Amino acid sequence: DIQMTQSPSALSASVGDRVTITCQASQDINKFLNWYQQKPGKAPKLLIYDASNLETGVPSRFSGGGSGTDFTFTISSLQPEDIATYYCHQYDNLPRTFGQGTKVELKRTVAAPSVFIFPPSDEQLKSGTASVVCLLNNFYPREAKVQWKVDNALQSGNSQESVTEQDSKDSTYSLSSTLTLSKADYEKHKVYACEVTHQGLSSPVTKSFNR
Amino acid sequence: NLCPFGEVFNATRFASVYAWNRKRISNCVADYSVLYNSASFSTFKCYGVSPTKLNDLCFTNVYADSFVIRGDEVRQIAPGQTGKIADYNYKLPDDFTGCVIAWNSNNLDSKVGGNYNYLYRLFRKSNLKPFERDISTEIYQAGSTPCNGVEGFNCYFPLQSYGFQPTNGVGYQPYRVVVLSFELLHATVCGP
Amino acid sequence: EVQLVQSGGDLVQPGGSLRLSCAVSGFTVSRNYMTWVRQAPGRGLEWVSLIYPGGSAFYADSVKGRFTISRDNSKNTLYLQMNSLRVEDTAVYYCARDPVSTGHYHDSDYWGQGTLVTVSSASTKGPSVFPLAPSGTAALGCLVKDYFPEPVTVSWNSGALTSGVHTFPAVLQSSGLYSLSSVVTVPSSSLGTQTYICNVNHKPSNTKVDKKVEPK
Ligand SMILES: *[C@@H]1O[C@H](CO)[C@@H](O)[C@H](O)[C@H]1NC(C)=O
């Protein structure tokens, strides 16, 4: 099939910056390339059809061009309402294919996380399983390192993480690290700690509690 | 009486696929091998007959249909194909006996900026029957409201431009197509 | 105006079958181009199939044979037959009409509201809700654990909170059940002076929970 290679995978910029996305085709598609915008949890919308022409209502700051294999997308000035995920789509060489997508991301200033550790609930302890929680509230950039330490012991493999989408207000992220253990394992130790490393920390942070 | 395939294959002008030309040839002799051995054809596909025999089989009239499509559409000019061309422009029967001959015509049929001359039908209320022609340019009613001769929302021009550009990829460059259909009946065409 | 409505999707099992519906208001379906597109869980977009106005239909190189596309002109509704469902087909699904650009006219494409489709073979379970206890401000939370299938909705204090609360995306665990949580940051002064309770609406099992959190 005509595979479509779209770059970049991730993109973060500030307001006013010009943004150029790219989509190459494995074979000639002439001018039959459409660029789509999808906002988080919503139907995608058509902006650039025929690789260059703009659909009705599309602001003039959006523009694209190309013919053949390489294709170019660009917003001359970034606007907050332009934060979404954009895909390239060919539609003249069946089967139709899409691109992986590019997630436009706003750029704020470095923000350190507010760490909050959460011991398991005694109800869940009587249920048979324990789940310790670590929260990194409001930080930027998204890059963060959570290490679980039980009785000053590095834990590996017994934890998962989930990160929120970028906020519309402060535009920060939040991270959740869940440590799952059997009740025998949780009762078989004492001190539980979450160590956080982010760009906005002089020394690593470490919240903790005792059983 | 040599069959006048010269007027068909080497014509200075062809047609848009939607308005495909037919030339009816009968009562003549032809050297099919002169055609078959020409290096100038990039596609020469036959169904129900070999190119190396044609000189020997006789037929009751031959129809020669001709038009222009894009290279990547030449495969649709075959039995049992589907797609916009086969469905809405020019359909071959399932029991087609004859040949499909195509060649790249970029040097003749392309124009800087795009040709506006050659068109294909985008939309129709139902698929064409085999060897049917539709040359109407009526506004297509896609919705619940009559167009009454005005183009716009749900009222679409039924034809689309190929926009043949000299710089197109070979798949998107113009190719000229001739379809030879052989009919038998009572009592013609024959070889030397 | 123009509107597309999708319905008829829920959990199925491997080898099962499911039909997707897409009602249309504004244009005749039997006389217009139409396609279905697949939005994987938190991933890219994928083309499934198309049908020319006039009969002809075309499918992707994975749903071919296993899937079918059809339409009913009376109700003016679009249908996607998905048979021999695999897990690789678990995703959201959209119905849309192709954009127009004839001569001296141009219009965009119209999309539907999207319907969620899940193939995983698992018993529907109810979410156990456990409290995240608190201790310059502070934080507490709710842990929506062990439930299936997606999705669920959460709201703190029946909607009395709209800022400072984060509901993390769900994570599917090895035990076949997903999990998520939602936290809240508030000053230590509000301890007891303000209500703390989360609401979990789970339509897949018709299970709704309303739990309260307080220090201990
Ligand atoms: C077209 O012209 C060439 C000139 O070399 C000739 O050889 C060929 O036979 C002509 N085509 C037909 C169908 O006669």
Side-chain angles (χ1 to χ4, degrees), chain A residues 1-2 4-30 32-38 40-41 43-44 46-102 104-105 108-125 127-144 146-148 150-153 155-168 170-182 184-186 189 191-209 211, chain B residues 3-6 8-21 24 26-30 32 34-35 38-49 51 54-55 58 60 62-80 82-90 92-110 112-115 117-124 126-128 130-137 139-140 142-143 146-182 187-192, chain C residues 2 4-9 12-18 20-30 32-42 44-50 52-63 65-74 76-120 122 124 126-144 146-147 149 151-161 163-172 174-176 179-185 187-190 192-194 196 198-202 204-207 209 213 215:
Chain A
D1 308 17
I2 296 202
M4 305 283 300
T5 55
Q6 164 177 340
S7 66
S9 51
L11 183 144
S12 187
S14 307
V15 184
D17 312 350
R18 77 189 311 264
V19 174
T20 308
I21 322 188
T22 283
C23 193
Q24 191 190 28
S26 45
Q27 315 180 16
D28 190 348
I29 78 175
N30 202 245
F32 311 100
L33 199 279
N34 291 16
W35 290 88
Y36 279 97
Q37 173 192 70
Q38 189 192 22
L46 179 58
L47 305 173
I48 301 186
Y49 79 97
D50 286 358
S52 73
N53 314 357
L54 298 183
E55 284 289 348
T56 53
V58 173
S60 56
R61 61 178 179 272
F62 298 103
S63 62
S67 177
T69 76
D70 296 355
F71 290 84
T72 61
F73 182 79
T74 291
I75 324 168
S76 58
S77 181
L78 200 157
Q79 292 276 357
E81 57 276 22
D82 308 342
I83 300 180
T85 306
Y86 303 81
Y87 301 81
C88 50
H89 177 59
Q90 80 96 350
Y91 69 106
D92 191 67
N93 183 306
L94 300 178
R96 299 184 176 183
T97 49
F98 288 84
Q100 296 85 350
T102 292
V104 169
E105 286 195 349
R108 67 179 319 285
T109 87
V110 170
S114 300
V115 188
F116 305 103
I117 192 168
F118 288 143
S121 67
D122 41 350
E123 169 190 3
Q124 195 199 351
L125 296 180
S127 304
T129 313
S131 302
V132 200
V133 175
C134 186
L135 166 70
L136 322 184
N137 196 192
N138 302 339
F139 61 93
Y140 191 97
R142 189 191 178 279
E143 291 60 85
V146 177
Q147 288 172 335
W148 279 103
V150 177
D151 293 10
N152 204 16
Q155 307 295 324
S156 180
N158 49 8
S159 58
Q160 297 192 40
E161 297 185 6
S162 181
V163 175
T164 67
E165 278 296 316
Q166 194 156 11
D167 178 22
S168 58
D170 49 63
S171 309
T172 71
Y173 301 102
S174 295
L175 190 149
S176 69
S177 178
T178 314
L179 182 87
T180 318
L181 283 176
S182 71
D185 301 333
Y186 173 76
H189 300 306
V191 176
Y192 296 79
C194 172
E195 162 187 308
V196 192
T197 306
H198 180 272
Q199 184 178 353
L201 305 176
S202 309
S203 61
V205 181
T206 301
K207 291 287 176 293
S208 62
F209 69 91
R211 183 169 64 87
Chain B
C3 299
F5 293 101
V8 179
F9 287 87
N10 286 338
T12 55
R13 184 175 332 92
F14 267 63
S16 284
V17 65
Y18 87 91
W20 54 270
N21 278 9
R24 160 187 167 93
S26 60
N27 303 341
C28 56
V29 184
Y32 286 79
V34 167
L35 297 169
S38 296
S40 57
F41 303 134
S42 57
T43 293
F44 202 132
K45 294 173 319 260
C46 297
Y47 303 80
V49 67
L54 287 160
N55 279 349
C58 309
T60 67
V62 192
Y63 309 139
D65 305 330
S66 59
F67 48 81
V68 171
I69 52 177
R70 339 201 170 222
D72 72 335
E73 292 170 2
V74 172
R75 333 167 161 91
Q76 288 188 47
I77 312 309
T82 66
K84 323 168 157 163
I85 301 311
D87 293 332
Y88 303 137
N89 288 270
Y90 182 81
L92 289 173
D94 294 53
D95 61 347
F96 174 61
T97 58
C99 309
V100 174
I101 310 155
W103 63 100
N104 185 351
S105 65
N106 198 44
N107 59 328
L108 299 169
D109 289 324
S110 299
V112 181
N115 204 347
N117 176 32
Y118 294 109
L119 310 177
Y120 65 94
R121 189 169 302 274
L122 198 40
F123 310 92
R124 202 174 180 266
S126 68
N127 285 354
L128 284 176
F131 294 145
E132 184 175 14
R133 282 189 174 103
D134 188 351
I135 65 167
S136 307
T137 63
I139 305 300
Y140 181 95
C147 307
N148 294 329
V150 181
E151 188 181 346
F153 180 75
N154 277 341
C155 283
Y156 300 121
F157 202 75
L159 304 181
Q160 182 93 3
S161 307
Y162 281 113
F164 290 122
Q165 293 225 135
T167 59
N168 284 340
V170 48
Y172 284 92
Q173 282 181 23
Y175 279 66
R176 281 175 186 200
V177 180
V178 172
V179 181
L180 301 182
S181 306
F182 297 106
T188 66
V189 179
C190 292
Chain C
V2 181
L4 320 181
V5 190
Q6 316 181 201
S7 58
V12 201
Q13 214 214 10
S17 180
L18 189 42
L20 306 183
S21 309
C22 175
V24 169
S25 172
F27 56 96
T28 306
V29 181
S30 60
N32 196 4
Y33 287 82
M34 221 85 168
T35 59
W36 290 88
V37 171
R38 159 142 56 88
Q39 223 293 0
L45 322 193
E46 188 172 7
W47 184 67
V48 198
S49 173
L50 171 93
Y52 288 1
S56 303
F58 311 89
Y59 304 86
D61 283 356
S62 70
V63 300
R66 315 186 298 108
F67 288 47
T68 311
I69 178 179
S70 61
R71 56 185 172 187
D72 185 13
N73 183 29
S74 324
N76 212 29
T77 310
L78 182 65
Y79 299 129
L80 173 57
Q81 254 309 92
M82 318 178 290
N83 305 351
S84 320
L85 295 171
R86 309 192 184 101
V87 171
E88 314 158 4
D89 314 348
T90 300
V92 198
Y93 287 82
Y94 284 94
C95 55
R97 63 91 64 181
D98 274 353
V100 177
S101 54
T102 70
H104 53 289
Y105 182 89
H106 91 270
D107 196 0
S108 178
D109 59 346
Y110 300 90
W111 286 68
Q113 95 284 359
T115 179
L116 183 49
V117 169
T118 307
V119 179
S120 176
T124 307
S128 302
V129 178
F130 296 104
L132 302 175
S135 51
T137 58
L140 53 97
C142 282
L143 179 58
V144 180
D146 305 358
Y147 57 88
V152 310
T153 87
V154 197
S155 60
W156 275 76
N157 286 9
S158 300
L161 281 313
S163 64
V165 171
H166 302 283
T167 300
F168 293 89
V171 280
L172 191 144
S174 63
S175 50
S179 167
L180 66 86
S181 52
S182 188
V183 298
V184 48
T185 36
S188 61
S189 60
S190 66
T193 82
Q194 192 52 234
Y196 311 113
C198 55
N199 325 127
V200 179
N201 165 36
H202 188 230
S205 63
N206 296 346
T207 305
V209 193
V213 189

mmCIF file of all heavy atoms in Angstrom, chain B residues 3-10 34-35 38 40-41, ligand 1, unseen atoms left out:
data_model
loop_
_atom_site.group_PDB
_atom_site.id
_atom_site.type_symbol
_atom_site.label_atom_id
_atom_site.label_comp_id
_atom_site.label_asym_id
_atom_site.label_seq_id
_atom_site.Cartn_x
_atom_site.Cartn_y
_atom_site.Cartn_z
ATOM 1 N N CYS B 3 -8.264 -1.922 -43.446
ATOM 2 C CA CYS B 3 -9.055 -1.338 -42.366
ATOM 3 C C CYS B 3 -8.383 -0.045 -41.917
ATOM 4 O O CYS B 3 -7.163 -0.025 -41.705
ATOM 5 C CB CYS B 3 -9.250 -2.307 -41.202
ATOM 6 S SG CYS B 3 -10.131 -3.814 -41.655
ATOM 7 N N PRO B 4 -9.122 1.029 -41.755
ATOM 8 C CA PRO B 4 -8.538 2.322 -41.377
ATOM 9 C C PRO B 4 -8.119 2.559 -39.927
ATOM 10 O O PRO B 4 -8.504 3.546 -39.313
ATOM 11 C CB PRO B 4 -9.641 3.308 -41.775
ATOM 12 C CG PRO B 4 -10.908 2.526 -41.594
ATOM 13 C CD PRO B 4 -10.570 1.114 -42.011
ATOM 14 N N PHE B 5 -7.332 1.626 -39.358
ATOM 15 C CA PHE B 5 -7.029 1.759 -37.934
ATOM 16 C C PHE B 5 -6.098 2.942 -37.729
ATOM 17 O O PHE B 5 -5.958 3.429 -36.604
ATOM 18 C CB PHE B 5 -6.357 0.511 -37.340
ATOM 19 C CG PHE B 5 -7.225 -0.719 -37.277
ATOM 20 C CD1 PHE B 5 -7.105 -1.733 -38.213
ATOM 21 C CD2 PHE B 5 -8.086 -0.903 -36.209
ATOM 22 C CE1 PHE B 5 -7.884 -2.876 -38.114
ATOM 23 C CE2 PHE B 5 -8.869 -2.032 -36.109
ATOM 24 C CZ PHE B 5 -8.768 -3.024 -37.062
ATOM 25 N N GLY B 6 -5.463 3.395 -38.815
ATOM 26 C CA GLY B 6 -4.648 4.596 -38.771
ATOM 27 C C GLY B 6 -5.417 5.803 -38.281
ATOM 28 O O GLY B 6 -4.902 6.599 -37.493
ATOM 29 N N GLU B 7 -6.658 5.962 -38.748
ATOM 30 C CA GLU B 7 -7.469 7.091 -38.309
ATOM 31 C C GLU B 7 -7.768 7.007 -36.817
ATOM 32 O O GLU B 7 -7.993 8.037 -36.172
ATOM 33 C CB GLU B 7 -8.768 7.147 -39.114
ATOM 34 N N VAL B 8 -7.764 5.799 -36.252
ATOM 35 C CA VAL B 8 -8.099 5.591 -34.847
ATOM 36 C C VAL B 8 -6.840 5.749 -33.999
ATOM 37 O O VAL B 8 -6.765 6.650 -33.154
ATOM 38 C CB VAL B 8 -8.752 4.214 -34.623
ATOM 39 C CG1 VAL B 8 -9.059 4.004 -33.152
ATOM 40 C CG2 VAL B 8 -10.028 4.095 -35.439
ATOM 41 N N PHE B 9 -5.842 4.881 -34.219
ATOM 42 C CA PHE B 9 -4.642 4.904 -33.379
ATOM 43 C C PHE B 9 -3.833 6.186 -33.531
ATOM 44 O O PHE B 9 -3.266 6.668 -32.546
ATOM 45 C CB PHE B 9 -3.760 3.677 -33.614
ATOM 46 C CG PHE B 9 -4.322 2.408 -33.035
ATOM 47 C CD1 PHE B 9 -5.199 1.607 -33.744
ATOM 48 C CD2 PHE B 9 -3.967 2.029 -31.748
ATOM 49 C CE1 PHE B 9 -5.701 0.443 -33.174
ATOM 50 C CE2 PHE B 9 -4.461 0.878 -31.178
ATOM 51 C CZ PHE B 9 -5.327 0.081 -31.891
ATOM 52 N N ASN B 10 -3.749 6.767 -34.728
ATOM 53 C CA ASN B 10 -2.821 7.883 -34.863
ATOM 54 C C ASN B 10 -3.563 9.198 -35.005
ATOM 55 O O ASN B 10 -2.994 10.176 -35.499
ATOM 56 C CB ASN B 10 -1.933 7.727 -36.101
ATOM 57 C CG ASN B 10 -0.853 6.677 -35.957
ATOM 58 O OD1 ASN B 10 -0.445 6.308 -34.858
ATOM 59 N ND2 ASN B 10 -0.369 6.200 -37.104
ATOM 60 N N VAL B 34 0.951 -6.033 -37.719
ATOM 61 C CA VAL B 34 1.591 -4.721 -37.805
ATOM 62 C C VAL B 34 1.312 -3.926 -36.538
ATOM 63 O O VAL B 34 2.171 -3.186 -36.042
ATOM 64 C CB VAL B 34 1.118 -3.982 -39.071
ATOM 65 C CG1 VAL B 34 1.521 -2.515 -39.027
ATOM 66 C CG2 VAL B 34 1.682 -4.652 -40.315
ATOM 67 N N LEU B 35 0.111 -4.081 -35.986
ATOM 68 C CA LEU B 35 -0.228 -3.426 -34.728
ATOM 69 C C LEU B 35 0.480 -4.130 -33.579
ATOM 70 O O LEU B 35 1.151 -3.491 -32.759
ATOM 71 C CB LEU B 35 -1.742 -3.431 -34.519
ATOM 72 C CG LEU B 35 -2.563 -2.654 -35.546
ATOM 73 C CD1 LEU B 35 -4.044 -2.963 -35.397
ATOM 74 C CD2 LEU B 35 -2.305 -1.168 -35.397
ATOM 75 N N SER B 38 4.221 -3.493 -32.974
ATOM 76 C CA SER B 38 4.674 -2.132 -32.710
ATOM 77 C C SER B 38 5.162 -2.005 -31.268
ATOM 78 O O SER B 38 4.457 -2.370 -30.322
ATOM 79 C CB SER B 38 3.545 -1.137 -32.982
ATOM 80 O OG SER B 38 3.187 -1.138 -34.354
ATOM 81 N N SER B 40 5.528 0.799 -29.820
ATOM 82 C CA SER B 40 4.907 2.012 -29.299
ATOM 83 C C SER B 40 3.791 1.761 -28.290
ATOM 84 O O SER B 40 3.359 2.718 -27.639
ATOM 85 C CB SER B 40 4.358 2.849 -30.454
ATOM 86 O OG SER B 40 3.444 2.099 -31.236
ATOM 87 N N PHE B 41 3.314 0.529 -28.125
ATOM 88 C CA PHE B 41 2.280 0.251 -27.137
ATOM 89 C C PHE B 41 2.885 -0.309 -25.855
ATOM 90 O O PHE B 41 3.641 -1.286 -25.888
ATOM 91 C CB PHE B 41 1.273 -0.752 -27.703
ATOM 92 C CG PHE B 41 0.632 -0.309 -28.982
ATOM 93 C CD1 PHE B 41 0.515 -1.185 -30.049
ATOM 94 C CD2 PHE B 41 0.157 0.982 -29.125
ATOM 95 C CE1 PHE B 41 -0.071 -0.783 -31.233
ATOM 96 C CE2 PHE B 41 -0.430 1.391 -30.306
ATOM 97 C CZ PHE B 41 -0.544 0.507 -31.361
HETATM 98 C C1 LIG D 1 0.679 5.217 -37.196
HETATM 99 O O1 LIG D 1 1.785 5.790 -37.900
HETATM 100 C C2 LIG D 1 2.933 4.933 -37.983
HETATM 101 C C3 LIG D 1 4.016 5.729 -38.674
HETATM 102 O O2 LIG D 1 5.285 5.102 -38.541
HETATM 103 C C4 LIG D 1 2.569 3.651 -38.727
HETATM 104 O O3 LIG D 1 3.694 2.780 -38.734
HETATM 105 C C5 LIG D 1 1.383 2.970 -38.054
HETATM 106 O O4 LIG D 1 0.970 1.847 -38.823
HETATM 107 C C6 LIG D 1 0.219 3.949 -37.911
HETATM 108 N N1 LIG D 1 -0.889 3.330 -37.201
HETATM 109 C C7 LIG D 1 -1.813 2.575 -37.802
HETATM 110 C C8 LIG D 1 -2.886 2.023 -36.915
HETATM 111 O O5 LIG D 1 -1.781 2.344 -39.007
#
